[PDB]
Design an enzyme around this catalytic site. Sequence first.
Site, PDB file in Angstrom:
ATOM      1  CD  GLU A 121      -9.099   1.024   3.083  1.00 19.92           C
ATOM      2  OE1 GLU A 121      -8.721   1.936   2.275  1.00 19.92           O
ATOM      3  OE2 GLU A 121      -8.215   0.420   3.751  1.00 19.92           O
ATOM      4  CD  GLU A 147      -3.149   0.922   1.981  1.00 14.47           C
ATOM      5  OE1 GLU A 147      -3.195   0.757   2.985  1.00 14.47           O
ATOM      6  OE2 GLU A 147      -4.325   1.403   1.520  1.00 14.47           O
ATOM      7  CG  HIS A 194      -7.881  -0.148  -0.597  1.00 13.44           C
ATOM      8  ND1 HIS A 194      -6.923  -0.295   0.231  1.00 13.44           N
ATOM      9  CD2 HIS A 194      -8.712  -1.147  -0.488  1.00 13.44           C
ATOM     10  CE1 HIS A 194      -7.094  -1.630   0.978  1.00 13.44           C
ATOM     11  NE2 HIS A 194      -8.169  -2.058   0.581  1.00 13.44           N
ATOM     12  CD  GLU A 225      -3.102   6.987   7.357  1.00 14.23           C
ATOM     13  OE1 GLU A 225      -3.425   5.636   7.706  1.00 14.23           O
ATOM     14  OE2 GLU A 225      -3.947   7.567   6.849  1.00 14.23           O
ATOM     15  CB  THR A 245      -9.250   7.124  -4.130  1.00 10.32           C
ATOM     16  OG1 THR A 245      -9.965   6.814  -3.213  1.00 10.32           O
ATOM     17  CG2 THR A 245      -9.361   6.580  -5.443  1.00 10.32           C
ATOM     18  CG  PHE A 246      -7.692   8.448   2.411  1.00 11.29           C
ATOM     19  CD1 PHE A 246      -8.469   9.628   2.876  1.00 11.29           C
ATOM     20  CD2 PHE A 246      -6.704   8.094   3.148  1.00 11.29           C
ATOM     21  CE1 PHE A 246      -8.255  10.316   4.034  1.00 11.29           C
ATOM     22  CE2 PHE A 246      -6.468   8.847   4.526  1.00 11.29           C
ATOM     23  CZ  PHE A 246      -7.141   9.972   4.848  1.00 11.29           C
TER      24      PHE A 246
END
Length: 288
Positions: free
Chosen positions: A244, A150, A209, A156, A184-185
């Site tokens: 998600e 990811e 996602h 994060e 996308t986030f």
Amino acid sequence: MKYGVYFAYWEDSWDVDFEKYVRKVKKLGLDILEVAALGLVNLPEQKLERLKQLAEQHDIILTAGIGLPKEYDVSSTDKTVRRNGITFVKKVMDAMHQAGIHRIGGTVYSYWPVDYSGPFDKPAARKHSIESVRELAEYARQYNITLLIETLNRFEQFLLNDAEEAVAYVKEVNKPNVKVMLDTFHMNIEEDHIADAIRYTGDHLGQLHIGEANRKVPGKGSMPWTEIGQALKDIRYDGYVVMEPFVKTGGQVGRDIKLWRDLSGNATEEQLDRELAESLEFVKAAFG
């Protein structure tokens, strides 16, 4: 293309029962359920098998999501932590095999959420990560398991913040069962242009996602869904698209997602079902 949702859309914690979500996802016309690896790894064999059988009965593809905690940081310069993390992920894959799950995505190559209060070494963390991921890729082969790396926003994680870093990282790992996962986030924060990041990633893209900038269900925000749809056509993506959405504040999920206000209008399970059904229709239209 096959469409799914993370069970966490409806929940407040990662470690819950998944069986209910297999029926629900089929009812809603979805192809995939993504469950938390954390809720598999110590699940009794009886329940791993029951989950596999429910997925077969309903013809649902099961995938697994993970964020490794500090204690299991496979990117650590501490050898004991590194080895503890590798052993834990092997254990996760043993459980995945019994539940008939072949794909593990998220922060499986380092720890999440990153703690910036203490200092870190990106270069050193990266080479440890690549060696850890090569070893886990090798262990995965016996189960036909694929690792999805990811790409995360800067807040994060520090290793892979854009498609460029993620593609370079995965090329270097150089394993057929290690692919890039875009979200996308995360792309919304780090990329110059979301459609161009997808185009760039091309053949490396193992899973997408999707959600709005604030992690509402697609259609509730300003994400360029048509461009994303076009970019996926441009790379002839025939792979998995997993919604998600996170709209619930107050729980372990709320805290780890860092959502400090309700975005669901206190939606019931039923209300969240109907909105996800509408979202799916919207996304498929947007993707042609």
